[PDB]
């Protein structure tokens, strides 16, 4: 199926003293593989997956140079945006940037993205055609005019359709033992009385990868959302994910209810029944 490479950058100004806190993370699909933290000792791009460690010193020197250049751009941007929004030097503000590329089922370029936010709100985003910009407000419109004149979209399109997908395919081959392995959810149901008359059925999906999953309840073969609870997909901490869905049922009618589990690692969806 489809694969993604994505970089996430966060820079938070420190008006009391010193430079912004800068944190950069790189992912292939739902696997973190590199990090940079301005607060950490190394001042280097650091590996976070075994398959990136085989990259040589040229790679790490290059990624360190680039991530430091990214940090300085975000430091300057915090100053520029304070100016555009007529904000005082006293308050802490945040810039976020995300970019990356998807390859499709055919292993070719599928899509690219480059999105920017100020104080957690959309600022400017590259449109899907990688040729035009979405500017949320008149500050972002100023940036759009600047980026059009400097042909930023052309520079990012070249990276997103080329370099980005070449390196994504490199990482996917080098890390294939994990990156190209699906971990199907380990599923089970629990039961406990909430009253003399009612019981909660909880459908568990554990130790799955990638994170994308659907848990649905049916009663007598028809979807039920009423009297259900679905928790946000959460990390196990070992690179896999967890999720559960629960339904409250009349005690003795548990056999009417089925939990349906959809995941890329399941050739057919699973059906669980108490």
């Amino acid at each position: 199926g489809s694969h993604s490479m994505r970089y996430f950058f966060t820079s938070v100004s420190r008006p009391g003293r010193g430079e912004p806190r800068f944190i950069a993370v790189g992912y292939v699909d739902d696997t973190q593989f590199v990090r940079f933290d301005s607060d950490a000792a190394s001042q280097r791009m650091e590996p976070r997956a075994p398959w990136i460690e085989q990259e040589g010193p040229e790679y790490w020197d290059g990624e360190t140079r680039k991530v430091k250049a990214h940090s300085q751009t975000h430091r300057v941007d915090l100053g520029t945006l304070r100016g555009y929004y007529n904000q005082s030097e006293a308050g802490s503000h945040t810039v976020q940037r995300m970019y990356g590329c998807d390859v499709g089922s055919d292993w070719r370029f599928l899509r690219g993205y480059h999105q920017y936010a100020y104080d957690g709100k959309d600022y400017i985003a590259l449109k899907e055609d990688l040729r035009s910009w979405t500017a949320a407000d008149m500050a972002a419109q100023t940036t759009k005019h600047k980026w059009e004149a400097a042909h930023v979209a052309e520079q990012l399109r070249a990276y997103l359709e080329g370099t980005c997908v070449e390196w994504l395919r490199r990482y996917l081959e080098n890390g294939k033992e994990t990156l190209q392995r699906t971990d199907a959810p380990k599923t089970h149901m629990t039961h406990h009385a909430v009253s003399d008359h009612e019981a909660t059925l909880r459908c568990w999906a554990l130790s799955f990868y990638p994170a994308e999953i659907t848990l649905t309840w049916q009663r007598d073969g028809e979807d039920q959302t009423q009297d259900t609870e679905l928790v946000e997909t959460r990390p196990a901490g070992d690179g896999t994910f967890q999720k559960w869905a629960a339904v409250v049922v009349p005690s003795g009618q548990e056999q009417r209810y089925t939990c349906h589990v959809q995941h890329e690692g399941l050739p057919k969806p699973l059906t669980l029944r108490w």
């Binding site: 990624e63 250049a69 990214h70 555009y84 920017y116 940036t143 400097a150 520079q155 370099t163």
Partner: peptide
């Protein structure tokens, strides 16, 4: 692999 080209500021 990060973007190589010098980033344009906002």
């Amino acid at each position: 692999y990060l973007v190589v080209v010098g980033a344009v500021g906002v």
